[PDB]
């Protein structure tokens, strides 16, 4: 009786924890394997390096993050989600022999956000509009967003924006923008905090941000050993809407429910 245990990790926050718990539930129900979820395991580069080193077995990675952060050189991608997925999938298999399974439906993009009041007061609708006020407002951005070419380096290069940026921890940036310590932050578009704190996402008028859909990323060797993982995890391929994920994020991060329970009830009610 081979009862291999898979280590399923997530980036920071309730959403990767929810996803990792969905993977665990699906794997334990439909395979002979068990899984352990590692919440808040780290940021993108750490999940990626841990995956390549074998320290974790699966994590949810996002299509535009594969092409921008993980592929070297980074290919030039369009705004069509399925083509970006194919670029990410083919590229990461060739580069790192990682198998990137089929993406979920929802997009979770970086989103430059300001309080509604600020957008109204300063006449902000687009990211380009921030040039109007870059000497007046303060931004608080995660370090990873600051480090990424599709993040603050891209605000600089694509938009010529020179924001006054405080580097922030992921879990502290929304309280900072809600309290007025900052007026700009790098939201994730499925974060529950956008609605909870009456924040407005500025339109990405120059299309800095690629599409970002999540999907399981694992070593090709793991899929070869356990080919059933493809069918089992692709249960979620093309499922989960933006509104659905944002509500799950609300349940875990705002209402404090366990990610396992929230994941289980969603799968029971909406997928299986
Ligand atoms: C979903 N997302 C917005 C495209 C980001 C979110 C993220 C980046 N780093 C951490 S931690 N989370 C990503 O996963 O690359």
Q: What Rg value do the Cα atoms of the chain yield, rounded?
A: 19
CB distance 266 to ligand 1 below 6 Å: no
State which of 19, 49, 62 you would mutate to test the pocket of ligand 1, scoring each by most atoms of that ligand within 8 A of its C-beta: 62
Structure token digits, residue 137: 């407002």
Other Cβ atoms within 10 Å of 202 Cβ, number: 19
The method of structure determination was X-ray
Q: Give the position, in ligand 1's atom list, of the atom nearest the Cα of 64.
A: 4
Ligand 1: distance of its center to the CA of 189 in Å?
A: 10
Query: Sign (positive/negative) of CA torsion 241, 243, 249, 255?
Result: negative
Judge if 176 and 227 occupy the same domain.
Answer: no
Judge if 42 and 53 occupy the same domain.
Answer: yes
Tell me how many degrees the CA angle 15-20-22 measures, rounded to the nearest 5: 95
Q: Measure the CA–CA gap between 183 and 181, rounded to whole angstroms.
A: 7
Is omega for the bond preceding 190 within 30 degrees of 0, making it cis? no
Residue 203, φ and ψ in degrees, nearest 5: -70, 130
Ligand 1: distance of its center to the CA of 231 in Å?
A: 25
Structure token digits, residue 234: 């692709």
Domain final position from 211, 230, 264: 211
Residue 166, φ and ψ in degrees, nearest 5: -95, 130
E-only strand ranges, the chain: 5-9, 34-38, 58-62, 98-100, 110-115, 138-142, 164-168, 184-188, 199-201, 214-219
| 103 contact partners, CB below 8 Å, separation of at least 6 | 63, 81, 85, 213, 214, 215, 237, 238
Residue among 5, 54, 18, 36 nearest 192 (CA): 18
Fill in the DSSP letter of residue 104: P
Q: State how far the alpha carbon of 68 is from the alpha carbons of 55, 78, 145, 149, in Å.
A: 23, 12, 12, 7
Judge if 101 and 229 occupy the same domain.
Answer: yes
- Which helix or strand (DSSP H or E) is residue 262 part of? helix 259-266
Q: State how far the alpha carbon of 246 is from the alpha carbons of 4, 61, 150, 233, in Å.
A: 32, 17, 23, 20
Whether 215 and 23 have beta carbons less than 8 Å apart is answered as no
Q: Give the position, in ligand 1's atom list, of the atom nearest the Cα of 214.
A: 1
CB distance 212 to ligand 1 below 6 Å: yes
- Which helix or strand (DSSP H or E) is residue 63 part of? helix 63-65
Tell me how many degrees the CA angle 215-218-223 measures, rounded to the nearest 5: 110
Domain final position from 161, 184, 211: 211
Q: Give the position, in ligand 1's atom list, of the atom nearest the Cα of 42.
A: 11
Judge if 198 and 239 occupy the same domain.
Answer: no
* Full domain range(s) for residue 66: 1-108+212-272
Q: Measure the CA–CA gap between 20 and 8, rounded to whole angstroms.
A: 6
Judge if 236 and 192 occupy the same domain.
Answer: no
Residue 138, φ and ψ in degrees, nearest 5: -115, 135
Ligand 1: distance of its center to the CA of 47 in Å?
A: 11
Q: Measure the CA–CA gap between 63 and 103, rounded to whole angstroms.
A: 8
Q: Give the position, in ligand 1's atom list, of the atom nearest the Cα of 212.
A: 4
Judge if 7 and 70 occupy the same domain.
Answer: yes
Domain final position from 211, 233, 254: 211
Judge if 91 and 165 occupy the same domain.
Answer: no
């Amino acid at each position: 009786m081979e009862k291999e245990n898979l280590i399923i990790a997530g980036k920071i926050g309730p959403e990767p924890e929810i996803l990792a718990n969905m993977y665990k539930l699906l794997i334990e129900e439909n395979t002979s394997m068990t899984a352990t979820v590692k919440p808040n395991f780290g940021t993108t580069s750490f999940l990626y390096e841990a995956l390549k080193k074998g320290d974790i077995d699966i994590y949810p990675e996002f299509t535009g993050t594969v092409t921008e952060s993980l592929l070297q050189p980074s290919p030039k991608v369009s705004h069509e989600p399925e083509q970006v997925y194919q670029v990410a999938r083919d590229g990461i298999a060739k580069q790192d022999h990682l198998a990137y399974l089929k993406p979920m439906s929802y997009q979770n993009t970086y989103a430059v956000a300001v309080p509604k009041k600020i957008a109204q007061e300063y006449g902000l609708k687009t990211i380009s509009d921030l040039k109007k006020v870059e000497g007046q407002l303060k931004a608080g951005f995660t370090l990873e967003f600051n480090d990424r070419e599709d993040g603050n380096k891209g605000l600089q290069s694509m938009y010529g924006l020179n924001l006054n940026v405080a580097t922030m921890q992921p879990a502290l940036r929304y309280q900072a923008i809600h309290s007025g310590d900052i007026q700009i932050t790098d939201a994730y578009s499925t974060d529950a905090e956008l609605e909870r704190y009456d924040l407005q996402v500025l339109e990405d008028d120059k299309q800095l941000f690629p599409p970002y859909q999540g999907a399981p990323l694992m070593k090709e060797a793991l899929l070869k050993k356990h080919p059933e993982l493809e069918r089992v995890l692709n249960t979620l391929a093309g499922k989960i809407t933006e509104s659905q994920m944002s509500q799950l994020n609300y349940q875990v991060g705002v209402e404090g429910k366990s990610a396992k329970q929230v994941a289980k009830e969603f799968l029971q009610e909406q997928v299986c």
